[PDB]
Ligand binder design. Structure first.
Ligand SMILES: C[S@@+](CC[C@H](N)C(=O)[O-])C[C@H]1O[C@@H](n2cnc3c(N)ncnc32)[C@H](O)[C@@H]1O
Length: 390
């Protein structure tokens, strides 16, 4: 009733902008919710099946260099595309038609094809096309394998390095997800490039005031400022310190697995001044004691509650009474949004989960900590949960 009226107004409005950053996303959500309302189950399942055929056509046409063979502007015949890529024109045509019917491609006349704004990213190698490939190659098989997986392993939340849904779907339940993706650096390459999209997002500086850390940096000129626990390449630490002279990158500690820390070293320019580099295992005792801030960003969602309590317990033991622990993770609403529920199930294929603030509270308290506050990013659920010793 009412929601149809609301969306209908957001439809009239955006029709004259054709002739507002929140305005785009209030309309994409309303269109989805309206679609769900008008739709009955039979239309739902036809829509679902169409999504699977569409991603399959996307995957094949990328793989076969068809999007490359279509000029970014102007038209080209199906015959000319098929000769360029050396493929049966009938098969090119049937798969292209899927994307024409869904608006990803545009057909001109009876025999010519052209790119749209929605298909051009697939014409080259980049984070978006890497995400498409990874979704199809690394997540869909695991999803389709979940019915058999839960009959095989029991119908409970899956956790643990071995016997992931992913490894089960690959025929190799004994191997870890790292071993699987590392045994074909072409696969690792698409995984790495795809994660480049979301490495920029949700910057910690500007969302969290570190002035209070500056005052600590002066009042104690010796103590470690910010320890980035599992910080990968240390980009979060860099952004924090970049143009803050009172927060010196040289006073911070980047921690990760020794193989990751070694790669950080081997890819730094000579005089580039960096934080301290420390290879370690955060399932073990925290080597740096009494830092002002411990940061653990996008690590806890990979693990069970019990493993998270062990990880956080090591940080709490190493923290001082005035220390702060910052957990950077999605905080699910109850119920969660569409993209975070989707990521929650994707994480289940590799032994992880997303969590509500209640689930984080249980884990944090078990580690001898307490939640002092939460800074949530605007327009999403990614947050920094500020914790202190209990
Ligand atoms: C999802 S990445 C997060 C990287 C970074 N914090 C960020 O926000 O982008 C998880 C990181 O944890 C590291 N890691 C995994 N297991 C670890 C362990 N046992 N000890 C230390 N680091 C670990 C990985 O090497 C990886 O850099």
């Amino acid at each position: 009733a009412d929601q149809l009226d609301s969306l209908a107004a957001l439809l009239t409005s955006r029709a004259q902008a054709v002739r507002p950053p929140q305005q785009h996303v209030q309309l994409v959500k309303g269109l989805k919710d309206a679609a769900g309302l008008v739709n009955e189950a039979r239309e739902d399942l036809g829509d679902l099946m169409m999504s699977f055929v569409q991603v399959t056509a996307l995957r094949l046409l990328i793989k076969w260099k068809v999007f490359e063979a279509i000029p970014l502007e102007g038209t080209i015949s199906y015959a000319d595309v098929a000769a360029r890529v050396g493929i049966d024109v009938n098969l090119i045509t049937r798969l292209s038609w899927v994307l024409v019917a869904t608006g990803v491609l545009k057909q001109d006349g009876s025999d010519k094809i052209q790119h749209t704004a929605r298909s051009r990213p697939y014409a080259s190698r980049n984070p978006l096309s890497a995400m498409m490939i990874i979704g199809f190659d690394e997540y869909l098989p695991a999803l389709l394998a979940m019915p058999g997986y839960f009959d095989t392993y029991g119908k409970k939340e899956p956790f643990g390095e071995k016997h992931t849904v992913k490894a089960f779907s690959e025929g190799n339940p004994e191997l870890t997800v790292n071993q699987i993706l590392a045994s074909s650096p072409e696969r690792l390459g698409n995984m790495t490039l795809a994660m480049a999209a979301m490495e920029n997002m949700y910057p910690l500086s500007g969302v969290y005031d570190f002035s209070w850390v500056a005052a600590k940096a002066a009042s104690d000129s010796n103590r470690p400022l910010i320890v980035d626990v599992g910080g990968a390449k240390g980009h979060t630490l860099q952004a924090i310190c970049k143009d803050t002279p009172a927060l010196p990158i040289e006073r911070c500690v980047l921690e990760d697995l020794p193989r990751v820390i070694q790669v950080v070293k081997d890819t730094s320019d000579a005089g580039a001044q960096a934080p301290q580099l420390l290879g370690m295992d955060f399932n073990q005792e925290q080597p740096v004691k009494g830092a002002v801030v411990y940061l653990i960003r996008r690590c806890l969602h990979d693990y069970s509650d019990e493993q998270c309590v062990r990880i956080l317990g090591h940080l709490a033991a190493a923290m001082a009474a005035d220390s702060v622990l910052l957990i950077g993770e999605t905080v699910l609403t109850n119920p969660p949004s569409r993209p975070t529920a989707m990521m929650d199930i994707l994480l289940a294929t590799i032994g992880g989960k997303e969590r509500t603030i209640d689930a984080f509270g249980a884990v944090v308290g078990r580690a001898g900590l307490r939640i002092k506050g939460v800074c949530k990013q605007e327009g999403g659920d990614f947050s920094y949960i500020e914790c202190v010793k209990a």
